[PDB]
Amino acid sequence: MNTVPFTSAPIEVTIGIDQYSFNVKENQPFHGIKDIPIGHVHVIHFQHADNSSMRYGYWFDCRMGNFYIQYDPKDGLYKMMEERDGAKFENIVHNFKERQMMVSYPKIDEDDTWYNLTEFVQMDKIRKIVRKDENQFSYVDSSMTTVQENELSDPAHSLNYTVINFKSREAIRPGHEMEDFLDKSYYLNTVMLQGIFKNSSNYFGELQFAFLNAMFFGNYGSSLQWHAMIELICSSATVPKHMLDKLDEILYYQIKTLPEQYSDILLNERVWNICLYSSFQKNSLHNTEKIMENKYPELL
């Protein structure tokens, strides 16, 4: 079980660690989070009390280094840092633990939510969407735009999601215009899966990462990407059964975890009504359809 040490908490802040969150008061004695499950990516995120603007956070995998959080009073944010002195790290951590100055990652043993939400998410693919190669961890916030978004302004700070555009030459074979537009299986299976993502696990990993950035940071381009990748599968007549069954599970746990008071801005009515009720896969998302109807029937 790993730890994220915090130097201190000089400003009052709501801290998230995966789907959990807690409040820390200004200059509260607080030195981080312990008992973090190894074997998953994680995200630690921040909402300052004074400025509910800018949610921001760091994707990380405790197997890739010793990471701690230090507040920067110049840039005005909690920064993730990697400690390369491994004995300095263990010794500080040991002292924090002895003083019981760390909150415990509060995973209930029955609870598989985080695994279910990050099943296909891998750090090496996050680091290709979020380009900052000097760090083993990846910063995301509310305002970052996507590559696709910037084609319609600072490239260094972009989310480099795979571009999906239904009215593009990439998506539409010459001489198959109607066929490829109404049935996107060509674009899903050949262009995207075989060509770009190589396999469905990589496709699902980007889909899950986009959702999580939409949910935790309100990142709008992320929400667009999540819906686009859902729509591409639902609008394909030919989808491997194993992908359809896993998509149903994936969406079910995303919809289950979404904050109920955020469904107005985070769920695209058109995409969901098409996927559940009109598309080729209207009958293939049983679990997702059932949670959607019992939790968000207004939308439908």
Partner: protein
């Protein structure tokens, strides 16, 4: 953006543009079958592609053979329209290609945009106007060429006849839409107005009678009156 009454004069500027109407592409008669069920039988159709500045009409005749063995024909018809419009644009020299295509029905936007991906510099636009181009098949010479076709075919017309030698494109388009609105609202009456006098002739190379200037004023007044009335005869006013 969309075309409406505010930006109506844009039609007559010097940027080449085409209207595309697909109302008459897929046409059927509905009839009872031996077993007392209902069936459709397609008849020949046409794409109405019009340059409103010049009057040039590109009438692509849609022969019933194109539907044989196909499903979801109302949807297919929009894509076939888009394929033929795109083929038309491809066949033209670059300096004759439209800078904008205005579709009369919004359902044509996605089919045309997809078939025109190779022409990023051609804007596909809808309109808010309720244009009466569906009444094109009430023009006898147009209905005739469509019905007689035994194969796919493109026929070229000027829907303004020689009017532009005397009036502006703006006035010619207003005359045309008046005629077509009348034919749409009451074809029998509108045709009675045009052909009541058999003394006045249609030139072999024209669609409309050879009215003098003063007969056109009379004709247009009779067409307005018709449209005024039928709007009463319908709303009782």
């Amino acid at each position: 953006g969309a075309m409406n009454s505010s930006n109506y004069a844009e039609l007559f500027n010097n940027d080449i543009k085409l209207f595309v109407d697909d109302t008459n592409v897929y046409r059927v008669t509905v009839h009872k079958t031996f077993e007392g069920n209902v069936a459709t039988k397609a008849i020949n159709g046409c794409i109405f592609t019009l340059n409103p500045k010049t009057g040039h009409l590109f009438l692509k005749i849609i022969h019933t053979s194109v539907w044989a063995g196909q499903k979801r024909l109302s949807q297919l018809a929009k894509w076939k329209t888009a394929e033929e419009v795109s083929a038309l644009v491809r066949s033209l020299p670059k300096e004759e290609q439209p800078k904008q295509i205005i579709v009369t029905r919004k359902a044509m936007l996605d089919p045309l945009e997809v078939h025109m991906l190779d022409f990023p510099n051609i804007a596909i636009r809808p309109t808010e106007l309720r244009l009466p181009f569906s009444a094109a098949m009430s023009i006898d010479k147009l209905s005739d060429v469509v019905m007689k076709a035994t194969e796919p075919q493109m026929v070229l017309f000027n829907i303004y006849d020689d009017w532009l030698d005397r009036i502006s494109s703006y006035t010619a388009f207003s005359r045309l839409t008046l005629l077509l609105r009348a034919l749409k609202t009451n074809e029998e009456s509108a045709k009675m107005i045009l052909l009541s006098d058999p003394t006045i002739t249609i030139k072999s190379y024209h669609l409309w009678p050879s009215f003098t200037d003063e007969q056109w004023i009379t004709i247009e007044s009779q067409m307005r009156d018709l449209i005024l009335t039928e709007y009463g005869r319908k709303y009782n006013v």
